[PDB]
């Protein structure tokens, strides 16, 4: 995407994650396991919900074309009415389509931003105790069990662990 | 050798959206917001039945055209419906002065 | 036909909840705003893979 995470430096998405748009997949002696980073997923869910609410409520006074009947010698005023309603409906269709397109763009890029930001959050803690394998994974230079991974998830990784 | 990996959700979906820079982008879950289906039946409005003028024009109903005895007595309505080109009209020819203005007034009664 | 709906168009009724529609300009009821488009999909998820 615009930030390079989705279909970028991370190859593709995990079918095995069902409870979050983003997450971790840890593998140590205590097994492997997926986990959802709930907080970032909630940021994204709020984003999308507020976007849908905005789309619904920002065009809640659009235009209502009520019908007016005219005789045969009021062709001018009838045509005025006709092309007026036509023009209003055209401009409001334009507005709806632009909103839909621009929001699709911003939303896809928002998700990309969230993935890149999560990768950066992990990297900024793991600074030197680990090494980037280039595709979204981090190799731990020390031994660290499931509570290590939990401290990484909730954001409290303790840097003093000897790593050689 | 422990290792942690970061990834994102995906699935076997096909629902496609459009972007201003790209067409037919496939996403995971998308919400349609446009309605395209109707039933084709002139159904009641908030329970109060319309006044479906079967074959009369507004002028015929108001004046009381003999072929319009369906509408000697009308109950309250919600909206008046008439054909595009009625056939029961001012049966005796002529005109209805400021016809359309009376139609406009009807649109509020 | 013997129905009951909360919106009416000269070519059918709309028992729908979406914010937009493209049936016919002239309506009456608490029904959505007319739009001249054939598709309005909004992306909630993220790009598939």
């Amino acid at each position, epitope marked *: 995407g615009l930030f390079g995470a989705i279909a970028g430096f991370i190859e593709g998405g995990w079918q095995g994650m069902v*409870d*979050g*748009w983003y997450g971790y997949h840890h593998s140590n002696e205590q*097994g492997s396991g997926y986990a*959802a980073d*709930k907080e970032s997923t909630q940021k994204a869910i709020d984003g999308v919900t507020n976007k849908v609410n905005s789309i619904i409520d920002k065009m809640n006074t659009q235009f209502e074309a009520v019908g007016r009947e005219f005789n045969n010698l009021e062709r001018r005023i009838e045509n005025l009415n006709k092309k007026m309603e036509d023009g209003f409906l055209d401009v409001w269709t334009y507005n709806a389509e632009l909103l839909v397109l621009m929001e699709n763009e911003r939303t896809l890029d928002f998700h990309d931003s969230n993935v890149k930001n999560l990768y950066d959050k992990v990297r900024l803690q793991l600074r030197d105790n680990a090494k980037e394998l280039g595709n979204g994974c981090f190799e731990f230079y020390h031994k660290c069990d*499931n509570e290590c991974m939990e401290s990484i998830r909730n954001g409290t990784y303790n840097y003093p662990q000897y790593s050689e | 050798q422990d290792q942690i990996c970061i990834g994102y*959700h995906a699935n076997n979906s096909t629902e496609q959206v459009d972007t201003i820079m790209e067409k037919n982008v496939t996403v995971t879950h998308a919400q349609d917001i446009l309605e395209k289906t109707h039933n084709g039946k002139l159904c009641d409005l908030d329970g109060v039945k319309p006044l479906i003028l079967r074959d009369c024009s507004v002028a015929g109903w108001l004046l009381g055209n003999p072929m319009c005895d369906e509408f000697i007595n009308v109950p309250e309505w919600s909206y008046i419906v008439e054909k595009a080109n009625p056939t029961n009209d001012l049966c005796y020819p002529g005109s209805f002065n400021d016809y359309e203005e009376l139609k406009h007034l009807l649109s509020r009664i | 036909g013997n129905c009951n709906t909360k919106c009416q168009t000269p070519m059918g009724a709309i028992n729908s909840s979406m914010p937009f529609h493209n049936i016919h300009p002239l309506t009456i009821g608490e029904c959505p705003k007319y739009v001249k488009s054939n598709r309005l999909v909004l992306a*909630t*998820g993220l790009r598939n893979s």
Partner: antibody
Amino acid sequence: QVQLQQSGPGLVKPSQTLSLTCGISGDSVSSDAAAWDWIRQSPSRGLEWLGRTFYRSRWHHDYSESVKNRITINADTSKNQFSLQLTSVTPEDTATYYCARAGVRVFGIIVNSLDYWGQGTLVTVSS
Amino acid sequence: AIQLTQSPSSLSASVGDRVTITCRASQATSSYLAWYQQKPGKAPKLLIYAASTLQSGVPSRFSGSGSGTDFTLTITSLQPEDFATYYCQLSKTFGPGTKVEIKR
């Protein structure tokens, strides 16, 4: 609508193999819009999430931490059922086990809030 | 992992009286939260999910609200059938549960 009907022996010898089986009616265990969880409730521990399975492209198993390597959940489409298989049972497992269908979503993603439940199977371990 | 607290640990009110329960999560994930009811001897029964949305088939007398770390479940007029143990869950973990007792 949906129905989950549980079965399995209520008495299981210590350190032996516990095995419950939740038969489904009204949907498909191969549904792409749900997941199938196993929960346990005890007066001491309350409700605890044990395990989960689902199907997107392969069969996915999501187990808990209190049952690391101690649990296995299977889905059999031939009978439309899914099965809980818990090894090395100890006295701490005496509880009521529920099979649930996690499947109320919010923008397509499954929050895990259980949606339908089985009538529960009480299970005690003893000598 | 995540730890939930639930308050009060028990209560007692009469029919008709409005009661409220609070589930405090250490995390703010607004939706992912869900309130279940448990009568004695029966499995839970999902009442509210996403902390403000109601499951189909539940009487309207329940209502979920709140955000940040504090979520609330409000019952407007109790019933002899609402006597129960109410649980709140955060995506995989259930709160200890409160006991709604009928005072008469």
